[PDB]
Amino acid sequence: SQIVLPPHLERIREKLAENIHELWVMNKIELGWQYGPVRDDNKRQHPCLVEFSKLPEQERNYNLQMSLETLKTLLALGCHVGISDEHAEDKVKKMKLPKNYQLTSGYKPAPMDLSFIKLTPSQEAMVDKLAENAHNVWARDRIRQGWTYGIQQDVKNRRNPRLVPYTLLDDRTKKSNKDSLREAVRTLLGYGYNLEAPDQDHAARAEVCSGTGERFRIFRAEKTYAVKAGRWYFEFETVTAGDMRVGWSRPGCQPDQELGSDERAFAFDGFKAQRWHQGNEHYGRSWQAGDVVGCMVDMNEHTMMFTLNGEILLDDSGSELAFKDFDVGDGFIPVCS
Numbered sequence: 001s002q003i004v005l006p007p008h009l010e011r012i013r014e015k016l017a018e019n020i021h022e023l024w025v026m027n028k029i030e031l032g033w034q035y036g037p038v039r040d041d042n043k044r045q046h047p048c049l050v051e052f053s054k055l056p057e058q059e060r061n062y063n064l065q066m067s068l069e070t071l072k073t074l075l076a077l078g079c080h081v082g083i084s085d086e087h088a089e090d091k092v093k094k095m096k097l098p099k100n101y102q103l104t105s106g107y108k109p110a111p112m113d114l115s116f117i118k119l120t121p122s123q124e125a126m127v128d129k130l131a132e133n134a135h136n137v138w139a140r141d142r143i144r145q146g147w148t149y150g151i152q153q154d155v156k157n158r159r160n161p162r163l164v165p166y167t168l169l170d171d172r173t174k175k176s177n178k179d180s181l182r183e184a185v186r187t188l189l190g191y192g193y194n195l196e197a198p199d200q201d202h203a204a205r206a207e208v209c210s211g212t213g214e215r216f217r218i219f220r221a222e223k224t225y226a227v228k229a230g231r232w233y234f235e236f237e238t239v240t241a242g243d244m245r246v247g248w249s250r251p252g253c254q255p256d257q258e259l260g261s262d263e264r265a266f267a268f269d270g271f272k273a274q275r276w277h278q279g280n281e282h283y284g285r286s287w288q289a290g291d292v293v294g295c296m297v298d299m300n301e302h303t304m305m306f307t308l309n310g311e312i313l314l315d316d317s318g319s320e321l322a323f324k325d326f327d328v329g330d331g332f333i334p335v336c337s
């Protein structure tokens, strides 16, 4: 609402609204509709088949403010629009239509053909977002009206399964809205108002919005199973690929502290190909879903090794040792984060 509307859109919005409404009245007459004073559906009767001045002007103003909000959301979403040239709006070629596809009156509704206009992929994403906004507005209207979501459509209880996010909406209706809005956008583009979408900016959630402030959970064996001598082996299978650390930890490891950030833990972060002990150093490669990590510790000569599906991981140097020398201390236990 706070957006201010440029004068050229201001004196072109009426013609845009009438032309797009005429596109829908051409769509319904192609789908097989017939004009009727009463707003029937089974008998194919509705006043919204005739041109913009011959149907109820209250519906005309409804669709006019619909066009206004469409273009005004186009501006609100940062899609600045200019004109290619004023003569491209002065002269518009008209398609040829059969009479049955034509309306009742002689005001030829159909604009220059859809084939002439090309839609940039950025513009396609722009129409995708604009239809998202339109569906959100429509749903919010019925939310104020009292409608709520239901698994099955109900009229007396005011329950509609369509009151769902657009990403979960039904494909047929969402694509119908998509194509209608795409026809409208193609019309504005053909009018010489070549709209360029704002530069596509990438946003990363980075696993920040985890449920509850807990960012990780550490799983370890019991302290009594700590090994102080000998060489041992255990496996870690990664169902998913992401922020995972596996290795060996001392019985003093703190659950709230990340593995390898301090001395108690020796871990291998394969998300970043990153080894962790009192800091992070580059070691090995990254895994994928289903990869199995084999962890080796030899408490006699104080070395640790890792494998990824069998092949031994190597650091920046050709050394096979993830960690070269560490005190035995109180022992080590298997651990994962």
Ligand SMILES: Nc1ncnc2c1ncn2[C@@H]1O[C@H](COP(=O)(O)OP(=O)(O)OP(=O)(O)O)[C@@H](O)[C@H]1O
Pocket: 048, 059, 062, 063, 142, 153, 160, 162, 163
């Ligand atoms: N000016 C118009 N011209 C043509 N069709 C219109 C117009 N205004 C509304 N409609 C139709 O009426 C619908 C309005 O939805 P409404 O809230 O009345 O029904 P609903 O019970 O929520 O529908 P659904 O089961 O599709 O969710 C629009 O989706 C569209 O199909």
